[PDB]
């Protein structure tokens, strides 16, 4: 299902294929067990709805009633709760999400799968003391997951050691090149080091990997804005306007 | 010969080919000395560093005084074609071909490299004379080949075994590509290959047991295709160093801007970058930009420019932010945006002040008038008047300027002409700029040299001596145009001269169709006036003068307020004079003609003085007082035949008098 | 005097007479767009797949200039 | 770049009338030690652009003796309380 996820690019194609799974799609009832080949009582068709409609942030449909249906069947599923916690994070709802993730840590202490968002939240939160809790704890597990090298980078950034924290971000990206979110964080720590030149290419790579990155455009627009190039930055800010028109800050 | 391209900081397979050649030359066992022209075409592109600013500077040093062959792509097919041309080049070509066959293993590669460092390359000349016992030629480090081989030696000891395997996997890939080529069929058997191959293959120390299984190691790795091949990571088809890529790109853009090259091969290969070498090689972005302008794509030009100026600024420690805007300012002026270019330029001034560096201010000032030269209508909008710059740059310094004074005086000459100053001053001002431009190298400063020709041709044409203009126009370059002024401006300029000729040959249909294009084209000011002047002349020929008369006055009235162009004011005024006298009423123009006569008598431009004389003669003959007109024309007939293009009018009036 | 091109959900508006470029988004997908005096009329994409479903309550958007908010038709 | 003085004419007339801070780039930053590379000489900066080949050339040159210079200083065998760094300093004084 994932490799079928990555091939999808836009929401309209999500609706294109979603219909195909409904009208002209059926499972081999011989191989599958009974009471399962039904599309309405399937599971990854439901798990389909939860992942694709929200990772791409597409228009939700047949999404609610499936959601609580999965909570009833899978009350103890760690992956579901983190995704459910992720949904609160994606809606800029940080207090509720913190409660959601806190169950994950207590229930599942060893999961370097979605805690990148947790440390991302905690950085916004402050409580460097709580952040120093995670960095010591997460690094103790192993230092080869993509997340564990971004968890610690946040803690080092909060303490104003950018020249060290900058290195960990590059380490975190090297392990898994798909984590493009580290690129913008890479550039930010350059800005606080008063090396604007090094910063500009940094955000720039982030938008080559995927043009539809609101964060990358905004971070690059700022770096020119810090300099007296008010107009040379108008293009970057202008480009970012299309991505999230519905923001007061931009 | 095509394939994926990747930048490599290691020994490219192309590099070994030179190392193949240098081995034969220094060995002196075969008596084969590779011609010097061959080396200078191969090694020289690998020589590092040229630099090329995007705009704001054109071929200020890139142009070679001697025309050089294009750099060679790293394919055996292209390399062999260089040696193949000679009648005895087959012997040299086979020498390379045999060595590539003898080198069947990574160890054999090492045998070549160990041989050169131990014996061929030597630290210095002082040990040449003591090494007269050497049977092979010895190399000095500082020499042309010596410095290259030192770099190649460095690039081999620089890496681990991981890089050496990539050399051999790529070379065999590189060698086998030439195998399925028509030329290889032409060289399937050449007997000399076996002779040269056996020369170095000797002393193998085993031929019965290891060679049975040595082949097995080679073949098993190779794609024998008997079974499924051993699975290995995808390997690039071609490897080039950064410096080699610099030469091929620079030559391509220069060739594009204005021994055969392979445009398709270069372009195809440049499209397969892993997007990381593009960061290491920012110039790939601008190569699309120059291509982008050719087809007049707006957004595709912009992103490329922004792409280029983001990677360049970070890579170079010096602040080039003050340079990015000017290029963007040029780009806007390229699409006649003009006003948007104005805003772009102002913040460039502020940035220059913060850097607090003097040398960049000269660059920013020189761009000002270059922009205003194209668009003189914008002079009032700048925060500095044009005359302030000329006064400033004339006394800028006495050293570290070189080209500034050459730039400085030409602007004064243009202003002096437009201000219709006395010819004595204009001649002197152009004299200064002519002397300073020619004193230094004119070939290298191709832009200013062309500008000199344009001014001089224009200057002497205004005086009415086409004979002088005829000599200089042969030096004017066509289709070259200039930077920051569109890309089809040359096409438009050539077309206008066609329309004027068409008007002379009474081809009213063609010129009529062109005026339709006029009202919806984006044109430069100098172009705009010509078409504006073209329309009024066309309307005169048709016969309708009520429209033209209302049209000519609007032009000249706006030819004195918006732009203080006196020369174009004169040309429009006399057209109105023609319109009046042609309609049997030129008496109204008597106040207008006289006020110009005495005015231009002081100026002393004979062409101006003579033309008004003919108009004065023509009005006097449509009155019925041709008697005195004949008397006046008789006394001045001597001095009016000096100007060619008025002779046709002058001659025609003569039969009228008879 | 601006030249406008309409994508599926994004409109690019390039100043030709004077000025630079602007770009605007839209609340939902657009089937087609029709020019009218001082603005554009945009009709929603009806169906895509092969089920055929469509909306009828409101599918037309009126905009005068890119910066101002859209308007709703009246019938 | 004749500077108006390389011109023989104007240079003749003048005689008669008389009567860079460095900042790191991304590629400079490596992954292992957070200290960025600092170029040793202006030759390694190519028109202000750090040549990547020269950078890695110096890096290889620094590490190559590092394996050889390992046993210096801290390492001490057992049964010899005196590390080898001073084995050669006493050896130097022995002949000298």
Tab-separated table of N, CA and C in Angstrom, chain A residues 40-50 62-77 80-81 83:
chain	number	residue	atom	x	y	z
A	40	UNK	N	-16.753	-2.956	1.980
A	40	UNK	CA	-17.269	-2.131	3.067
A	40	UNK	C	-16.771	-2.602	4.429
A	41	UNK	N	-16.514	-3.899	4.589
A	41	UNK	CA	-16.005	-4.438	5.843
A	41	UNK	C	-14.514	-4.737	5.791
A	42	UNK	N	-13.821	-4.273	4.756
A	42	UNK	CA	-12.379	-4.430	4.698
A	42	UNK	C	-11.709	-3.499	5.709
A	43	UNK	N	-10.382	-3.567	5.762
A	43	UNK	CA	-9.604	-2.856	6.763
A	43	UNK	C	-8.637	-1.862	6.135
A	44	UNK	N	-7.778	-2.322	5.228
A	44	UNK	CA	-6.808	-1.413	4.630
A	44	UNK	C	-7.456	-0.487	3.616
A	45	UNK	N	-8.650	-0.834	3.129
A	45	UNK	CA	-9.472	0.173	2.465
A	45	UNK	C	-9.834	1.271	3.450
A	46	UNK	N	-10.171	0.889	4.681
A	46	UNK	CA	-10.337	1.881	5.735
A	46	UNK	C	-9.003	2.535	6.071
A	47	UNK	N	-7.972	1.721	6.327
A	47	UNK	CA	-6.640	2.274	6.552
A	47	UNK	C	-6.176	3.093	5.360
A	48	UNK	N	-6.645	2.746	4.161
A	48	UNK	CA	-6.429	3.612	3.009
A	48	UNK	C	-6.943	5.015	3.259
A	49	UNK	N	-8.188	5.132	3.716
A	49	UNK	CA	-8.809	6.443	3.840
A	49	UNK	C	-8.047	7.302	4.838
A	50	UNK	N	-7.619	6.695	5.943
A	50	UNK	CA	-7.002	7.457	7.019
A	50	UNK	C	-5.675	8.064	6.588
A	62	UNK	N	-15.935	9.932	3.335
A	62	UNK	CA	-15.997	8.595	3.924
A	62	UNK	C	-14.895	8.404	4.958
A	63	UNK	N	-14.491	9.499	5.593
A	63	UNK	CA	-13.321	9.547	6.459
A	63	UNK	C	-13.661	9.485	7.935
A	64	UNK	N	-14.735	10.151	8.354
A	64	UNK	CA	-15.105	10.141	9.762
A	64	UNK	C	-15.544	8.751	10.198
A	65	UNK	N	-16.635	8.252	9.609
A	65	UNK	CA	-17.251	7.015	10.080
A	65	UNK	C	-16.274	5.851	10.045
A	66	UNK	N	-15.296	5.901	9.146
A	66	UNK	CA	-14.240	4.903	9.154
A	66	UNK	C	-13.316	5.104	10.344
A	67	UNK	N	-13.085	6.361	10.731
A	67	UNK	CA	-12.108	6.652	11.776
A	67	UNK	C	-12.517	6.031	13.107
A	68	UNK	N	-13.715	6.359	13.603
A	68	UNK	CA	-14.140	5.777	14.874
A	68	UNK	C	-14.345	4.274	14.763
A	69	UNK	N	-14.648	3.779	13.563
A	69	UNK	CA	-14.743	2.338	13.370
A	69	UNK	C	-13.404	1.666	13.645
A	70	UNK	N	-12.302	2.315	13.263
A	70	UNK	CA	-10.985	1.745	13.527
A	70	UNK	C	-10.589	1.868	14.992
A	71	UNK	N	-11.023	2.931	15.672
A	71	UNK	CA	-10.762	3.032	17.105
A	71	UNK	C	-11.402	1.890	17.879
A	72	UNK	N	-12.625	1.504	17.520
A	72	UNK	CA	-13.285	0.419	18.235
A	72	UNK	C	-12.549	-0.899	18.025
A	73	UNK	N	-12.190	-1.207	16.778
A	73	UNK	CA	-11.555	-2.489	16.492
A	73	UNK	C	-10.127	-2.522	17.026
A	74	UNK	N	-9.399	-1.408	16.918
A	74	UNK	CA	-7.988	-1.334	17.295
A	74	UNK	C	-7.834	-0.278	18.380
A	75	UNK	N	-8.105	-0.631	19.627
A	75	UNK	CA	-7.982	0.345	20.715
A	75	UNK	C	-6.554	0.471	21.215
A	76	UNK	N	-5.753	-0.566	20.981
A	76	UNK	CA	-4.407	-0.654	21.523
A	76	UNK	C	-3.362	-0.506	20.419
A	77	UNK	N	-3.777	-0.137	19.212
A	77	UNK	CA	-2.833	-0.045	18.107
A	77	UNK	C	-1.991	1.217	18.244
A	80	UNK	N	-2.067	3.664	15.124
A	80	UNK	CA	-3.271	4.472	14.975
A	80	UNK	C	-3.216	5.702	15.870
A	81	UNK	N	-2.852	5.512	17.139
A	81	UNK	CA	-2.867	6.622	18.085
A	81	UNK	C	-1.895	7.714	17.670
A	83	UNK	N	-0.859	8.387	14.635
A	83	UNK	CA	-1.526	9.062	13.531
A	83	UNK	C	-2.661	9.942	14.032
